[PDB]
């Protein structure tokens, strides 16, 4: 809930509902320039694995750009796309897919 | 522990007699070579070996074949053979292929192999290959192996890259990981697999020597390093990196380790596959919008679109003779394996399973290994390149995906 941005099929933009959530992250990172965030991006299963890396990367990147828009240091933000290799849940309909189309902000 | 199960290619194909091989010892042979040869030929989708219950005779030599007994059954060739022990503990495995149609009693091919016990299946497969090529004119691939990734539910190392023979026997674990493994690729000599691992925290692309487990680091630049493919002349590895901000194609000279960039677009360019000349690649690009397959010479020039089937195409594997590719073709919310004749542009859909991906061709171009989803997990599927033969390799211990067919071994 506080560290995940969700996306519709073939969409990669940060939509308004996540703005607030992301700002807390920017606030935090601006304050602790010691800190590094890893944006893990994902795609649902439709597609093929090496191509769907890119759908994950567009999502993670978009989080990165937004945070940089909030004053965060480029060097506090790395991105790792898992494509469709690490689903949050199994299943073959939109309930499963919307759950898996996401970018997760994690502090490693 | 994978085994092949055929779904269709059942009770059809060219009729052939395969006789249990004679055994020069007490008890049963250490291995049922005629059983192997029968199974292989049936697995090819081209033959219907007569079942054991119906054999009209069980000759243990060529001279003992009675051709008329097989022509009466519309069977025009018969495999017989012998397994004998040697004093050093090894075995001789010999077959003779006997014409039982228009040249009755003529020995069309024969051979003998000296192997130790642990290589009896190997010898059986060599006998299948020779019989197969003699009768159909197509080089046999029964000695080949497949690589694939097994993912169990839980445990500290849920992801395993493994290799087995093409029919499931002699499985071994290549590498275990806490994090996903992707896209194994065989070197043309069969000695190494390239793959992608996320066990460090991000993707790394490596090449593992199978005989000793040695690992060569190829690429771990920021972002993604994956989608490897070895050039058929042994000189290069193509792959994809997204450090520039989108996936692009690179090639590494394996001798020097020198990496060269091949595509530099703002689109994503990935899943490279080699044409027979080790100079051209087919690959997936999204530059036109939805993914399609393109073709580029690694030495210079603009990639050219080659697919127009349905709405979307990607993830291609070009045949060892360059005449066709198979690929994953998407339409109406479904995706299946398709074959495209590279000279005419014609397309035939091969598969009807669900969520088909990652097709790999056998090195004779007659068979495709790929993965689909059955219930909540991935499984492996086989379909011939004429779309008539279909089988599976059901597994016991988890989902199975990312198949890759070895070169000839």
Swiss-Prot record, chain A:
Question: Keyword Ligase on this protein?
Answer: no
Superkingdom of the organism of origin:
Bacteria
How does the annotation summarize its subunit structure? The Tol-Pal system is composed of five core proteins: the inner membrane proteins TolA, TolQ and TolR, the periplasmic protein TolB and the outer membrane protein Pal. They form a network linking the inner and outer membranes and the peptidoglycan layer. Pal interacts with TolB. Interacts with the C-terminal domain of TolA. This interaction is proton motive force dependent and requires TolQ and TolR. Can form a complex with TolB and OmpA.
What is the taxonomic lineage of the source species? Bacteria, Pseudomonadati, Pseudomonadota, Gammaproteobacteria, Enterobacterales
Localization: Cell outer membrane
| Ranges annotated as spanning the membrane | none
Q: Which GO terms describe its cellular component?
A: cell division site; cell outer membrane; membrane
Q: What happens when the gene is disrupted?
A: Mutants lacking the tol-pal cluster suffer delayed outer membrane invagination and contain large outer membrane blebs at constriction sites and cell poles. Tol-pal mutants fail to complete division and form cell chains, and fail to process denuded peptidoglycans at the septum.
Give the GO terms filed under biological process for this record.
cell division; cell septum assembly; regulation of membrane invagination
| Record-stated family | Belongs to the Pal lipoprotein family.
- How is it placed in the membrane, per its record? Lipid-anchor
List the source organism: Escherichia coli (strain K12)
Its job: Part of the Tol-Pal system, which plays a role in outer membrane invagination during cell division and is important for maintaining outer membrane integrity. The Tol-Pal system is also required for polar localization of chemoreceptors clusters. The system also appears to be required for the activity of several outer membrane-localized enzymes with cell wall remodeling activity.
Task: Tell me the ranges covered by the OmpA-like domain, including all copies.
Answer: 1-107
Q: What is this protein called?
A: Peptidoglycan-associated lipoprotein
Coiled-coil stretches, from where to where? none
The alphabetical list of record keywords is: Cell cycle, Cell division, Cell outer membrane, Lipoprotein, Membrane, Palmitate, Signal
Counting on the full-length protein, the chain here runs from: 67 to 173 of 173
UniProtKB/Swiss-Prot annotation, chain B:
Check the record and name the SUPFAM superfamilies matching this protein: TolB, N-terminal domain, Tricorn protease N-terminal domain
What do mutants without this gene show? Mutants lacking the tol-pal cluster suffer delayed outer membrane invagination and contain large outer membrane blebs at constriction sites and cell poles. Tol-pal mutants fail to complete division and form cell chains, and fail to process denuded peptidoglycans at the septum.
Keyword terms: Cell cycle, Cell division, Periplasm, Signal
Protein location: Periplasm
What are the boundaries of the region TolA box? 1-13
Transmembrane ranges, per UniProt, are none
Highest taxon above the source species: Bacteria
Q: Which PANTHER family match?
A: PROTEIN TOLB, PROTEIN TOLB HOMOLOG
Q: What is this protein called?
A: Tol-Pal system protein TolB
């Amino acid at each position: 809930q506080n560290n995940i941005v969700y996306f519709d099929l073939d969409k990669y933009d940060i939509r308004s509902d996540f703005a607030q959530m992301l700002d807390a992250h920017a606030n935090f990172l601006r304050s602790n320039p010691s800190y590094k965030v890893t944006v893990e991006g994902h795609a649902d299963e439709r597609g093929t694995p090496e191509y769907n890396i890119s759908l994950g990367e567009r999502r993670a990147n978009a989080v990165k750009m937004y945070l940089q828009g909030k004053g965060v240091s480029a060097d506090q933000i790395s991105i790792v796309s898992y494509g469709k290799e690490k689903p949050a849940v199994l299943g073959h309909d939109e309930a499963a897919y919307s759950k898996n189309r996401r970018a997760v902000l994690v502090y490693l | 522990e994978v085994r092949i199960v055929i779904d269709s290619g059942v009770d059809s194909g060219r009729p052939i007699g395969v006789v249990p091989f004679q055994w020069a010892g007490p008890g049963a042979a250490p291995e049922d070579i005629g059983g192997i040869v029968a199974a292989d030929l049936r697995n090819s989708g081209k033959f219907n070996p007569l079942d054991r219950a119906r054999l009209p005779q069980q000759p243990g030599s060529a001279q003992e074949v009675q051709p008329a007994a097989w022509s009466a059954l519309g069977i025009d060739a018969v495999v017989v053979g012998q397994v004998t022990p040697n004093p050093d503990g090894s075995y001789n495995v010999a077959y003779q292929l006997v014409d039982t149609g228009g040249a009755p009693g003529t020995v069309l091919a024969q051979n003998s192999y000296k192997v130790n016990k642990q290589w009896l299946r190997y010898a059986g497969h060599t006998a299948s290959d020779e019989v197969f090529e003699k009768l159909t004119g197509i080089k046999g691939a029964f000695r080949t192996r497949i690589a694939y990734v097994v993912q169990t539910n839980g445990g500290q190392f849920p992801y395993e890259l493994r290799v087995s023979d093409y029919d499931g026997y002699n499985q071994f674990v290549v590498h275990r990981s806490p994090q996903p493994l992707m896209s194994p690729a065989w070197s043309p000599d069969g000695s190494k697999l390239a793959y992608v691992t996320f066990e460090s925290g991000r993707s790394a692309l490596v090449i593992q020597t199978l005989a000793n487990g040695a690992v060569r680091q190829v690429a771990s630049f920021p972002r993604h390093n994956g989608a490897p493919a070895f050039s058929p002349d042994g000189s290069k590895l193509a792959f994809a990196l997204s450090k520039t901000g989108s996936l692009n194609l690179y090639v590494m000279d394996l001798a020097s380790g020198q990496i060269r960039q091949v595509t530099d677009g703002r689109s994503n360019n990935t899943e490279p596959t080699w044409f027979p000349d080790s100079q051209n690649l087919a690959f997936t690009s999204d530059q036109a919008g939805r993914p399609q397959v393109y073709k580029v010479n690694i030495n210079g020039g603009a990639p050219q679109r080659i697919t127009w089937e349905g709405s979307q195409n990607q993830d291609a594997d070009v045949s060892s003779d360059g005449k066709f590719m198979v690929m994953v073709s998407s339409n109406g919310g479904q995706q299946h394996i398709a074959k495209q004749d590279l000279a005419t542009g014609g397309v035939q859909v091969l598969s009807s399973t669900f969520l088909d991906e990652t097709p790999s061709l056998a090195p004779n171009g007659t068979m495709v290994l790929y993965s689909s989803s059955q219930g909540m997990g991935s499984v492996l599927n086989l379909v011939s390149t004429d779309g008539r033969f279909k089988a599976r390799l059901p597994a016991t211990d988890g989902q199975v995906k990312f198949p890759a067919w070895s070169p000839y071994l």
